[PDB]
C-alpha cells in the first residue's frame, strides 16, 4: 500500500516559528514538548497555550460549575468514596421535580441544578469570546466563532429557553452521564415521538451530511496527496494539478464539482446547519406542537399499517371500566 497517507514513516524535528499576534504574545504559557507516538498522526509538539482574560474567566466559571455538579453527585451516594466511583455514571444533578413554574427552586430540589446551569452558560460564553478574539488577534476571519455560536445557542435552547417558553424549569436537561441521556427518551415520549418532528429530520440530514462530506473531502485530499494537495491554501491562490484532478474526479462522478476553497464552505455550512435546524425544532416543540406524531397525521405524512394481531380498543373507554 501507500503508507504515507495512513501514518508518517519518517518524522521531522526542528525550530517551530511563532506568529506574533496583535496583542497577548506575552500570555503564551508552558514548555512545548514532543510525543513521538503522536508524531505518527499529526504534529508531535504539544505546548504552549494562550492564556489571557477570556480563558481565565472561562476556567473560573467552568470549574465552579463542575464543582457544584460533582459535589452534588457525591452527595447522592452520601460521600462513600468507593460507591461513588462504582456508581458514577448513574449519578446526577437533576432539575426540579415538582411544578414550581419558573420560580427559583429550593436548594435541595433543583436549586443547585440551576446555579450550575448559569455557570456553565457563563463559561461557554467566555470561551466564545476567546475563540472570536484570537481570530481577530491574528488577522483571520471569524468563521470558527460563528459556527461555535450556533452550537452554544442550541445548548441554550434545551437548557433554559425551551423551559421558559413552556414555563417550567422541570424540562431542563440533567447533569450526569446516564441521566443526561434518560432525558432524551423522556423528552421524546412527552412530545409525541421525535422521529416525527421535521426539524429532527433536517438536523440528522445535515449531520449524516457531515459524515458523507468529511469522508469524501478527507478521502479526496489523501487521494491527491501525491501531488501535494494537502497544501490546501497555496492550492487556493495558485491552482495545481492536485485539485484539478480532485475536481475532475468529482465532476465525472456526480456530475458537478466544487473548488478547493468552496468545498470548505459547503462543510462549514452543513456543520452550522445541524445546530440551527435543531434549535428551531426545539423552539417549536411544546410551544406550537404538542405531539409530533399526531401533527404528522393531521398533515397525512404518517404511514399506517394493518393490524397483525387483532386490533385493541382502549379499555379505559369501555362500559364499566375502572380508573
Amino acid at each position: 500500500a501507500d503508507y504515507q497517507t495512513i501514518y508518517t514513516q519518517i518524522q521531522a524535528r526542528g525550530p517551530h516559528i511563532t506568529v506574533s499576534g496583535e496583542w497577548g504574545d506575552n500570555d503564551r504559557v508552558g514548555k512545548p514538548f514532543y510525543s513521538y507516538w503522536l508524531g505518527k498522526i499529526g504534529d508531535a509538539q504539544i505546548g504552549p497555550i494562550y492564556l489571557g482574560a477570556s480563558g481565565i474567566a472561562a476556567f473560573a466559571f467552568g470549574s465552579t460549575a463542575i464543582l457544584i455538579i460533582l459535589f452534588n453527585m457525591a452527595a447522592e451516594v452520601h460521600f462513600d468514596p468507593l460507591q461513588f466511583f462504582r456508581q458514577f455514571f448513574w449519578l446526577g444533578l437533576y432539575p426540579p421535580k415538582a411544578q414550581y413554574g419558573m420560580g427559583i427552586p429550593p436548594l435541595h430540589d433543583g436549586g443547585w441544578w440551576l446555579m450550575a446551569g448559569l455557570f456553565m452558560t457563563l463559561s461557554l460564553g467566555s470561551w466564545w469570546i476567546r475563540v472570536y478574539s484570537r481570530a481577530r488577534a491574528l488577522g483571520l476571519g471569524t468563521h470558527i466563532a460563528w459556527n461555535f455560536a450556533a452550537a452554544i445557542f442550541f445548548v441554550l435552547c434545551i437548557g433554559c429557553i425551551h423551559p421558559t417558553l413552556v414555563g417550567s424549569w422541570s424540562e431542563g436537561v440533567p447533569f450526569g452521564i446516564w441521566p443526561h441521556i434518560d432525558w432524551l427518551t423522556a423528552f421524546s415520549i412527552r412530545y409525541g415521538n421525535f422521529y416525527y418532528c421535521p426539524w429532527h429530520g433536517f438536523s440528522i440530514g445535515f449531520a449524516y451530511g457531515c459524515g458523507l462530506l468529511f469522508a469524501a473531502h478527507g478521502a479526496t485530499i489523501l487521494a491527491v496527496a501525491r501531488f501535494g494537495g494537502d497544501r490546501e491554501i497555496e492550492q487556493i491562490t495558485d491552482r495545481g494539478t492536485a485539485v484539478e484532478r480532485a475536481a475532475l474526479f468529482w465532476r465525472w462522478t456526480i456530475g458537478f464539482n466544487a473548488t478547493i476553497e468552496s468545498v470548505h464552505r459547503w462543510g462549514w455550512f452543513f456543520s452550522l446547519m445541524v445546530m440551527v435546524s435543531a434549535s428551531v425544532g426545539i423552539l417549536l416543540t411544546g410551544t406550537f406542537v404538542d405531539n409530533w406524531y399526531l401533527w404528522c397525521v393531521k398533515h397525512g405524512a404518517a404511514p399506517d399499517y394493518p393490524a397483525y394481531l387483532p386490533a385493541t380498543p382502549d379499555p379505559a373507554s369501555l362500559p364499566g371500566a375502572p380508573k
Binding site: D2, T18, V19, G21, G30, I41, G42, D43, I46, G47, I49, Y50, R86, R130, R134, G139, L140, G141, H143, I144, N147, F148, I181, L184, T185, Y195, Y196, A207, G211, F214, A215, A216, G218, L222, A223, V224, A225, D230, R231, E232, I233, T237, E244, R245, L248, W252, T253, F256, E261, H264, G267, W268, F269, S271, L272, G300, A301, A302, P303, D304
Partner: protein, 273 residues
C-alpha cells in the same frame, strides 16, 4: 461541456472491465461498464418502487412504504406484494451501490489518483449489507430487515431500538454516537479555519499555513497539522459505522437482554458490590 483545464486529462484506458466499448463520457458523466450497469439498476429499481407504491394505500411521499416479507417466509421468496418487491428493490439497491463504487475505481485509475474515495464509500455500503443481509441471516428471516419508506424506515429503527430496552446504553451505539458528534464539530472547525485564512476580511493579506497552526495552538494548545486533519477526518467519519456495526450485529444474535442490564458486568463486580 468541459472545464477550461479538463481536456488534457480525458484519455483512454483504466477501465476495470470490458475496455473501450463503454469508455466514454455522456456530458460531464463518465460512463464505463459500471455506469451502464448502475443506470440499469437505478432505473429498474426506482420504477419498481413506483409500481409497488401504486398498489399501496397512499401516495403521500412520506407515507409510502415497501415492507419486507412476514417472518413465516424464512429466508425464502415471498409473494410479490406480500414482501417480494421489497426483495426485488433490495437487490437493485445493492446492484446500484456496487456498480457505483466500481465506477469510482475506474475513474480514479484514469486520473492516477489514489483509491481512497471508493474505499471510503465502501464503509456505508457495508453497514447497509449488515442491516439488510447479515443480521437477517443470523436471525434467519428477511423479515428482520428494514422497509423502504421515508417515515416508514424510522419506525423500524424506533421499534428495533426498544426491543432491547433502551438502546442508548448499547456500547456500540455509544461509540458510534461519539464519532458522529466529533466528526460534525471537526468539519466545522476545518471548514472555518481554511475559510478564515483565505478570506481574512478587509484588504488584509491572505494568511499562511503558520497562522493556521498558531490559531489552534493558542485556543486549545495543540495543532494536529494540515495533512493529518484530512487523514483524521476520514478516520472519524468512518468509525461512525465501523463501531456501530458491532453494536448492531450484537443485538439479537449476541445479546437478548436490555442493553442497560449489560453494564451489570461492571456494576456488579462482587468486590465492591
Amino acid at each position: 461541456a468541459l472545464l477550461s483545464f479538463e481536456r488534457k486529462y480525458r484519455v483512454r484506458g483504466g477501465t476495470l472491465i470490458g475496455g473501450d466499448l463503454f469508455d466514454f463520457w455522456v456530458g460531464p458523466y463518465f460512463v464505463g461498464f459500471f455506469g451502464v450497469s448502475a443506470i440499469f439498476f437505478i432505473f429498474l429499481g426506482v420504477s419498481l418502487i413506483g409500481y409497488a407504491a401504486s398498489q399501496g394505500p397512499t401516495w403521500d411521499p412520506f407515507a409510502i412504504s415497501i415492507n419486507p416479507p412476514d417472518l413465516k417466509y424464512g429466508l425464502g421468496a415471498a409473494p410479490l406484494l406480500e414482501g417480494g418487491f421489497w426483495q426485488a428493490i433490495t437487490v437493485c439497491a445493492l446492484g446500484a451501490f456496487i456498480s457505483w463504487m466500481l465506477r469510482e475505481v475506474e475513474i480514479s485509475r484514469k486520473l492516477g489518483i489514489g483509491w481512497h474515495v471508493p474505499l471510503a464509500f465502501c464503509v456505508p455500503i457495508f453497514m447497509f449489507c449488515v442491516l439488510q443481509v447479515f443480521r437477517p441471516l443470523l436471525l434467519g428471516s428477511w423479515g428482520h430487515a428494514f422497509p423502504y419508506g421515508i417515515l416508514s424506515h424510522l419506525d423500524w429503527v424506533n421499534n428495533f431500538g426498544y426491543q432491547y430496552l433502551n438502546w442508548h446504553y448499547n456500547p456500540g451505539h455509544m461509540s458510534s454516537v461519539s464519532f458522529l458528534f466529533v466528526n460534525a464539530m471537526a468539519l466545522g472547525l476545518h471548514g472555518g479555519l481554511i475559510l478564515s485564512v483565505a478570506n481574512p476580511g478587509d484588504g488584509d493579506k491572505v494568511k499562511t499555513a503558520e497562522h493556521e497552526n498558531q490559531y489552534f495552538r493558542d485556543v486549545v494548545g495543540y495543532s494536529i497539522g494540515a495533512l493529518s486533519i484530512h487523514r483524521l477526518g476520514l478516520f472519524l467519519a468512518s468509525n461512525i459505522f465501523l463501531t456501530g456495526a458491532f453494536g448492531t450485529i450484537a443485538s439479537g444474535p449476541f445479546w437478548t437482554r436490555g442493553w442497560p442490564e449489560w453494564w451489570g458486568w461492571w456494576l456488579d463486580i462482587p468486590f465492591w458490590s
